[PDB]
Amino acid sequence: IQRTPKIQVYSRHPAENGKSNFLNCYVSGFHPSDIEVDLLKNGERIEKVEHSDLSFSKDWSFYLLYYTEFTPTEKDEYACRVNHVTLSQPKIVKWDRDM
């Protein structure tokens, strides 16, 4: 009786190179609640990532917001890596400015 996470990687404000912003990874619709979420910068785990406290939707599925202050650049690549019992391997979603 398990539900796979829906993962969205996005910035709080429209991205502008060299301008401070917030990188978000919103993981939702998952069950059970145990989940591993990391924000990556050039394939390397970002260390001071905060997250919202576990909560859930009307359908009982869980959601969490992982976030960090960042300054986007033309060359730096950002991603969100998620591991959950429903996944064969950790899922990596690269950050795309258009989404």
């Binding site: 978000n24 609640s33 406290d53 009982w60 989404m99």
Partner: protein
């Protein structure tokens, strides 16, 4: 407008790895104001909103005892429900609870609620009248009989349409200066070729509150449901939400498509069109 006060609880058993993980979170509308996490350093109910910090030591002592009492109840209920559902002691299981109340803009009580889940599915819920219960199955009916015999609905009602309303009004007064207000979406459309012959039209809604919104796509005034990619409404991380809806269109046919935005903060529903030339 209307407001709500809600408490959310999650208890997850960890067989042979200690006591269950317990997380409690209190919200006023969509703003977290208190939290308890069994894995946190303090072992106390903690403030999460600036306006709740002014509460005194007796407030925090009471909230800590009461949230710990719910934790202990869930711990014994995980064992009880494993028994009702004929499950072994080896697997991890989850209890989720949400309860709260809504008030109108004039502070009047509107509704109260309590819903319980087991392993992410309905278990038992209090009914709209605050007098009766709906059990999801025959195992949950065992709880309903226990709560009917204990007159639990009356005790819970005295909180939901009483205590809950009293404190929600106090929190709204204490947090009036910062509490998130209705904000209409900022809307725009983006265009992304996927090849030489097709493009994605993406209709955006940003910085809006409440989270409730409807984004629809139409081709020549006819609904595009089943061809639209809708993302889940997501937090900006500032108290407002984002959402987008996308449609894959043939290049040169962009102007046939219209995006329709419905939101409570808008005077009228919006229509967006990709206008080329």
């Amino acid at each position: 407008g209307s407001h709500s006060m809600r408490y959310f609880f999650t208890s997850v058993s960890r067989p042979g790895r200690g006591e269950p993980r317990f997380i409690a979170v209190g919200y006023v509308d969509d703003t977290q104001f208190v939290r308890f996490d069994s894995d946190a350093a303090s072992q106390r109910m903690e403030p999460r909103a600036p306006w709740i910090e002014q509460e005194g030591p007796e407030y925090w002592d009471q909230e800590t005892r009461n949230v710990k009492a719910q934790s202990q109840t869930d711990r014994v209920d995980l064992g009880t429900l494993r028994g009702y559902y004929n499950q072994s002691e080896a697997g991890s299981h989850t209890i989720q609870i949400m309860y709260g109340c809504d008030v109108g803009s004039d502070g009047r009580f509107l509704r109260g609620y309590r819903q319980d889940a087991y392993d992410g599915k309905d278990y038992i819920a209090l009914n709209e009248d605050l007098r009766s219960w709906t059990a999801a199955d025959m195992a949950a009916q065992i709880t309903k009989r226990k709560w009917e015999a204990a007159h639990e609905a009356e005790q819970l009602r005295a909180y939901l349409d009483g205590t809950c309303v009293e404190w929600l009004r106090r929190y709204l007064e204490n947090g009036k200066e910062t509490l998130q207000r209705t904000d209409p979406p900022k809307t725009h459309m983006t265009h992304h070729p996927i090849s030489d012959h097709e493009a994605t039209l993406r209709c955006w809604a940003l910085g809006f509150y409440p989270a409730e919104i409807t984004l629809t796509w139409q081709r020549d005034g006819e609904d595009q449901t089943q061809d639209t990619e809708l993302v889940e409404t997501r937090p900006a991380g500032d108290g407002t939400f984002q959402k987008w809806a996308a449609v894959v269109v043939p290049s040169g046919e962009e102007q046939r498509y219209t995006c329709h935005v419905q939101h409570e903060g808008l005077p009228k529903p919006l229509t967006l069109r990709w206008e080329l030339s």
